[PDB]
Amino acid sequence: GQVLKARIRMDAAIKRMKEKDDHRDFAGELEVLCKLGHHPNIINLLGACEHYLAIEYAPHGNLLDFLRKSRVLETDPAFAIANSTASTLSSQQLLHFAADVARGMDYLSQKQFIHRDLAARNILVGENYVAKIADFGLMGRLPVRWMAIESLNYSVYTTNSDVWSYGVLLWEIVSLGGTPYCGMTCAELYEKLPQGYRLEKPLNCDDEVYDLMRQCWREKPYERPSFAQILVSLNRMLEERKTYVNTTLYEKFTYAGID
Binding site for ligand RAJ (CB under 6 A): 3, 13-15, 29, 32, 36, 42-43, 53, 55, 57-58, 115, 124, 133-137
CB contact set of 219 (below 8 Å; sequence gap of 6+): 149, 194, 196
* 15 known ligand binder: yes
- CA 128, distance to chain mean position in Å, is 17
Specify the residue, 14 or 72, whose C-beta has the smaller distance to ligand RAJ: 14
* 20 known ligand binder: no
* CA atoms of 32 and 11, how far apart (whole Å): 22
CB contact set of 99 (below 8 Å; sequence gap of 6+): 231, 234, 235, 238
Q: How far is the CB of 240 from ligand RAJ (least distance, A)?
A: 30
* 69 known ligand binder: no
Q: Are 241 and 161 in contact (CB under 8 A)?
A: no
22 part of the active site: no
- Measure CA of the first residue to CA of the last residue in the chain; give whole Å: 28
Q: How far is the CB of 156 from ligand RAJ (least distance, A)?
A: 17
Specify the residue, 55 or 216, whose C-beta has the smaller distance to ligand RAJ: 55
Specify the residue, 151 or 204, whose C-beta has the smaller distance to ligand RAJ: 151
Q: How far is the CB of 11 from ligand RAJ (least distance, A)?
A: 9
Specify the residue, 30 or 152, whose C-beta has the smaller distance to ligand RAJ: 30
* CA atoms of 91 and 111, how far apart (whole Å): 31
Catalytic hit among 100, 106, 117, 162: 117
* CA atoms of 227 and 166, how far apart (whole Å): 9
* 3 known ligand binder: yes
- Cite the active site residues: 117
> Which residues are annotated as part of the binding site?
1-3, 15
**Residues contributing to the annotated binding site for ATP:** 1-3, 15
